[PDB]
Design a protein around this ligand. Structure first.
Ligand SMILES: N[C@@H](CCSCCCCC(=O)O)C(=O)O
Ligand SMILES: N[C@@H](CCSCCCCC(=O)O)C(=O)O
Ligand SMILES: N[C@@H](CCSCCCCC(=O)O)C(=O)O
Ligand SMILES: N[C@@H](CCSCCCCC(=O)O)C(=O)O
Ligand SMILES: [Zn+2]
Ligand SMILES: [Zn+2]
Ligand SMILES: [Zn+2]
Ligand SMILES: [Zn+2]
Lengths: 348, 340, 340, 348
């Protein structure tokens, strides 16, 4: 089924994880420029990541095309698109052509320049026939809207997610307003992605939801937060924290943190539930297992976890076996293991 | 160049990471049993991980045979062939000794595996993850009886094995049983691990015995662990996330290991490709080259020097990441827990 | 020199600490009721505390009359007479407004106390610990009707009073009701407190109104508190120990308060004599003198320069204590809690 | 009753708190030299502290004579002694003449010099007729023993407490041995004081106890630990921690931590239960209330606390009232309130 049909059919769409961060850790991406050349340099590495996400329950394979626009090549987009489709066809998933904020917009290159960059990328996805489009990682509504108006042209479903928190985009536009302007432009799915942990992200989504309601408008809700806890981030997101991007390890969410996220996202009415930087395959599976009752099945990766925490029953040690209760893991306040370190830092 | 060759020549041999923890995360292993059944069910998954480690700088592709005892050895062989790497057949403590069971039954389990590595001709062997010096000894005795060099590492800390046997004595009895390479693996973080290796190294020296040192610690900080290691921590094995070492923690470990005289420097549970790469980069001057994966990195954050924000560009340097006391991001959580 | 004199002359008036929390610790007050009944039961206890604050540098001996409404005023008078100090008659929010009860009943409670301070001739008055701008207003209205200068501080943070009234507006209505000195006291740590004072100061300025600023924050760090303050924290009031500010935290607060334009610098719950002394020492250059208690101290650890151990002597300096991120000593505990 | 009679009568002797630290905070003592001149300069300040401890349940008023020996005056000792007796006579307490380690011993001034300093102080206590003697704050057994042999001369009861942890004194003598040599010399009460928190302190006392048992010897057990948590201290004690002595605030024990300490001390067989640096009057009262059932009564300060945590019942706020349960406070993992700070530091 398609994306709007799935959603409308009352289904829960599970997104895929954070590619650049995941690939960076496996040795195929360079932190800093965070570019997707691995699609052509090392396709097997990209293909395997897609499969792990697919095996974890993702219903979407986003094209590894983050920062794959020009003035930042076209062979990459195409190669990425192929791998994504190549992998999607292996299960119940759709390919999603994605575009992000652009340098051209940042360097103040008026409004006719950027859309050309967007269209420049939209072209490959159309010739590749992707199932729908995502305008993600946008800190400015105006550029977000411009990207939407460009992608709707393809006549396909377009999702738009803002990299903003409860306080608004860089120009001061609250999330409620951002959601409206985004829907008034064509997006049938609106959400938030990156910059903040699941908790803060859902607060953002709640505000967008209420903004739409007060606008008598409607659209599917989507969320792809960081898998890193960020109680210390200011409105600028995790990038401003001292540990970005090489000391974020201690902040990584456990699978239990993500199941809680999925449950709250569902309760909020979010139906496209994914993740961004920090999300590894097991985090996506966490979304899948937690909402198994609401969906109707379990993903293939659950064959290596399945038993909710009860997998420890096959443990050779007694103490580990006592932790085979699901409420044990969901009530446990895990230790950081770094007593000589602080629990929060101040944004730069 | 075999394992003993490189070592004797005074070379630094980089090990691979922790396969079962890594694959569990990716969806191919089951936490609890921790079996390598994926070696036949999803070879490309096991193959890709091997390749990532190879690309990160590993000189050893340990056969995905922790526990159990099939096509794993082949995969390991195929990837080692793609670079400067050797295949290692490994055997871990048996659940047989777990349920006690004499010396006969144990060496039976081991022998079956050795014949396999015997048939696929591995470069050397690894008596791995042993909590009792005695069971580790029997393993070594069976392995040496194949001609291939044998490495033996204990899953014990400064207090010794689960029988009260000190690390120094433990090491002694390991070498006296034919071990050319000894050390530690798993159970404790890099810091506690090197304390243990130091003890072993001192017990060896006190006995006029010589042997190459090896270390494959957890990539998890465990200042709160007791003599039983991290499995006893309440967070094992599903809430260990916060404890994972940064690439900088690993570079510090690599230097220290090197300064201690360790030349078989690897990692265990928790170690992902970038961690191995950290070893290779930290010791790049010594070894004289950078691993392939370094083309996708920067020295101590160098890769960030072109980022848009000033304070992020400011992080493109050694002086920054090695002094940064990173935040846990969990103010409502404790920093340590009590074993059990 | 009266309270308004010193202030108008641009002098820095140092307040005293938190009597009820201090006495509770010493065994003279009851946590829960927090009544000043000790003023008649154990005068020397109340007297000694006043003296310690006076010796630490306080220029105001607030009458031990928080809640209730006797011999307290005398004690306060006697100690102020022993130094450069004034007596302050204080009245706090009534449990009457708590149980609602009109404007008549409340001003009745206040009036009884004002007559007392009226009869013992206090230097000035303090409308203290008010969570609602309205009830604080009535208090001020009754107090100004005595001729003595009136100071009014709210037990609210940046989000305003428990009715939704912003700090700026709250301050406005306080001055418009006769308050010559306004500010905040209790509920939040020094940092959140000065954020609140800044708001008040901005609401005052926006209204072309002028008045001396005052601050008496908790000596407890409360980064986790919500708009209701520390009473809502799970640790209130018996597990607050870890949150207590060091003398260095207080010196930082004192400087910041001063830079903000606050000239009535004091403290509330948690403030012990050495905390007050920290205010006096940090601002010693400005004020031009050190309090008597400074003969038993050293600037930024100077007093340790003769200690036997090297690393302790090393701590005899500013550059050390102001940069030191002190450990909690409780690794099995969280660093923040959730209100309720 | 006397000290050995009290103890022998199955009674629990409650010590007094940490004077120099308490006085330092109130403005009468100078951190660094930590000397007791306040006895003469400001007696009312000293007298009031003694009373607070007496009111909290202390059965002993130690003479504010720490670092009051010569080459570090005699009027101070006498003045202190008077205040202590002056206050003791106000209740069920004894006066205890105390002596600590000496500079003379540190500067290697042989064995005949030091005892003279000790005797030089013993003289005032005898002429003042103190109830018994305490040789406290000793990091070297040998000097501890020398002080004992000198104080027993007075024919009075002598208690000896070591400022050492589970690992032994500065010369490497384990606690077990230290306890023997201490009893073989005259002390009828042996213990530990200062340097470590209550938990580590009791571990030290357990080792001294077992040492005595293995020596077929016996003596009353005593403990006066710091009221500061020190899980990060090495065998040198809290002095080597970066925060000594001006940044120790966050480590201060709550009254609940101390009640747990008192209970465990009692269970270990300790009968002289006190405290050292960090202990304020409410900490001593905590010892008193916790062992009320084993003693038979409550101290006078309990009239301002009494109800075990149930004092919140008279609180004007609901939430506070819900914390009037004793098990609430004893299970609560209190927050440090400093998320930007570490939980442990490394000894210098
Ligand atoms: N769909 C993408 C989203 C990446 S968001 C990456 C933010 C990087 C910020 C920076 O420029 O440093 C992915 O899966 O990686
Ligand atoms: N070479 C092996 C070492 C595995 S050590 C795994 C310890 C598991 C403990 C448990 O059974 O829970 C690997 O790479 O995984
Ligand atoms: N000037 C007074 C201010 C007291 S503010 C006390 C707040 C108590 C809150 C409660 O009722 O628990 C003092 O010095 O104590
Ligand atoms: N009985 C005395 C014991 C004091 S122990 C003080 C240790 C100080 C260490 C130093 O010299 O800095 C008291 O009650 O203060
Ligand atoms: Zn992202
Ligand atoms: Zn392991
Ligand atoms: Zn207060
Ligand atoms: Zn002490």
């Amino acid at each position: 089924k398609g994306i709007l049909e799935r959603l409308n059919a009352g289904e829960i769409v599970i997104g895929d994880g954070g590619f650049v961060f995941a690939l960076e850790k496996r040795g195929y991406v360079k932190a800093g420029p965070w570019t997707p050349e691995a699609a052509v340099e090392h396709p097997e590495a990209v293909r395997q990541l897609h499969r792990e996400f697919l095996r974890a329950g993702s219903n979407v394979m986003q094209t590894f095309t983050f920062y794959a626009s020009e003035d930042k090549g076209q062979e990459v987009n195409e190669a990425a698109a192929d791998i994504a489709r190549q992998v999607a066809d292996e299960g119940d998933a759709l390919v999603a052509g994605g575009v992000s904020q652009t340098p051209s917009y940042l360097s103040a290159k008026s409004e006719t320049e950027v859309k050309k960059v967007f269209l420049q990328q939209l072209e490959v996805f159309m010739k590749k026939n992707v199932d729908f489009l995502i305008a993600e990682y946008f800190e400015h509504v105006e550029e977000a809207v411009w990207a939407v108006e460009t992608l709707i042209a393809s006549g396909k479903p377009v999702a738009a997610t803002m990299a903003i928190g409860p306080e608004g985009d860089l120009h001061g536009v609250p999330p409620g307003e951002a959601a409206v302007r985004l829907v008034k432009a064509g997006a049938s799915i609106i959400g938030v992605n990156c910059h903040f942990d699941p908790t803060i992200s859902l607060k953002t989504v709640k505000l967008m939801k209420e903004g739409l309601e007060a606008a008598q408008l409607k659209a599917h809700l989507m969320s792809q937060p960081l898998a890193y806890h960020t109680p210390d981030a200011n409105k600028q997101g995790f990038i401003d924290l001292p540990e970005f991007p090489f000391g974020l390890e201690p902040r990584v969410a456990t699978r239990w943190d993500i199941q809680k996220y999925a449950r709250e996202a569902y309760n909020l009415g979010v139906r496209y539930i994914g993740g961004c930087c920090g999300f590894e395959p097991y985090h996506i599976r966490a979304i899948a297992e937690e909402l198994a009752p609401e969906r109707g099945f379990l993903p293939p990766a659950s064959e290596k976890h399945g038993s909710w925490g009860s997998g420890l029953d096959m443990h050779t040690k007694p103490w580990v076996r006592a932790r085979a209760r699901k409420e044990y893991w969901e009530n446990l306040r895990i230790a950081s293991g770094r007593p000589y370190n602080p629990s929060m830092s101040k944004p730069d």
